[PDB]
Amino acid sequence: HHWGYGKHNGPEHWHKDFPIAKGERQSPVDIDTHTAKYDPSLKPLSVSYDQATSLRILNNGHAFNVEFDDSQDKAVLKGGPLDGTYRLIQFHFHWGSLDGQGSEHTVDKKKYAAELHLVHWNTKYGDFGKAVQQPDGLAVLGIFLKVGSAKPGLQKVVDVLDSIKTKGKSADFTNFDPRGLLPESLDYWTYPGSLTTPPLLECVTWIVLKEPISVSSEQVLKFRKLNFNGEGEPEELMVDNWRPAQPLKNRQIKASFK
Ligand SMILES: O=C1NC(=O)[C@@H](c2ccccc2)O1
Numbered sequence: 001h002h003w004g005y006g007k008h009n010g011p012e013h014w015h016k017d018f019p020i021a022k023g024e025r026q027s028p029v030d031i032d033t034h035t036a037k038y039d040p041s042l043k044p045l046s047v048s049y050d051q052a053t054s055l056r057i058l059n060n061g062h063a064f065n066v067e068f069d070d071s072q073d074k075a076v077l078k079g080g081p082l083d084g085t086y087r088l089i090q091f092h093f094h095w096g097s098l099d100g101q102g103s104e105h106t107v108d109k110k111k112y113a114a115e116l117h118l119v120h121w122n123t124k125y126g127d128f129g130k131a132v133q134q135p136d137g138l139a140v141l142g143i144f145l146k147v148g149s150a151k152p153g154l155q156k157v158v159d160v161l162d163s164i165k166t167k168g169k170s171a172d173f174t175n176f177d178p179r180g181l182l183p184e185s186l187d188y189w190t191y192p193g194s195l196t197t198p199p200l201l202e203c204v205t206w207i208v209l210k211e212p213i214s215v216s217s218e219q220v221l222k223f224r225k226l227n228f229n230g231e232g233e234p235e236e237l238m239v240d241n242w243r244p245a246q247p248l249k250n251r252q253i254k255a256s257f258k
């Protein structure tokens with residue numbers, strides 16, 4: 001598989017290796033705020049990140065992943081639309097070449113500069129590989145980034161990026177507190193969807209926060225200095241690593257708020 005984000009290998013081509021690309025519950029989607037319905041029975045959302053153990057940061061040629069120790073219930077998501085306990089495994093971002101694009105989800109067709117995905121898996125399936133084969137296997141917490149004031153809790157990430165410029169490079173990344181990347185409010189929209197990259201598996205409960213975080217232009221500029229290529233290959237800047245909105249089909253987006 002040689003998928004990516006270019007004219008020759010980007011989202012319009014994915015379907016040929018991964019036919020689920022045209023399936024019934026693909027992500028991302030546009031969130032139409034006037035059509036999403038408040039659902040009073042959503043239970044409160046529980047983000048329990050106090051014992052998180054970050055380990056490593058990896059440029060995988062598509063994004064950079066901050067990986068966690070998920071061998072125990074250290075950092076978990078519960079409540080909201082979720083049944084049971086979902087364990088944090090990694091977070092990453094999608095971003096643009098310019099501040100007017102980058103996010104995968106859209107809000108009333110608005111694109112944000114970037115979007116953070118905190119990926120968790122349902123502990124009742126035992127491991128991540130099993131969980132992605134189930135319709136309720138994953139819960140992805142999505143957080144929009146807008147350009148404004150700097151996010152202090154992001155800066156440790158931004159400063160390590162020079163050490164993982166190219167595909168396949170990793171760095172030790174211990175003691176990073178993902179609580180520093182959250183907005184104040186946990187108001188969200190939720191809907192059933194998919195992974196936004198190959199293999200495009202229809203295994204995700206999406207939880208998208210309404211309130212964006214603000215990052216500085218300098219912060220996002222540093223994201224854009226990464227490379228999709230490996231070391232010693234032609235430089236291709238890691239920008240516009242986002243999949244556009246997919247058809248909603250037979251789905252309803254629920255709001256946790258009035
Ligand atoms: O929402 C997603 N962002 C992605 O990069 C993709 C994904 C692929 C593989 C593992 C976890 C998530 O799905």
Ligand SMILES: [Zn+2]
Binds near residue numbers: 092093094
């Ligand atoms: Zn993602």
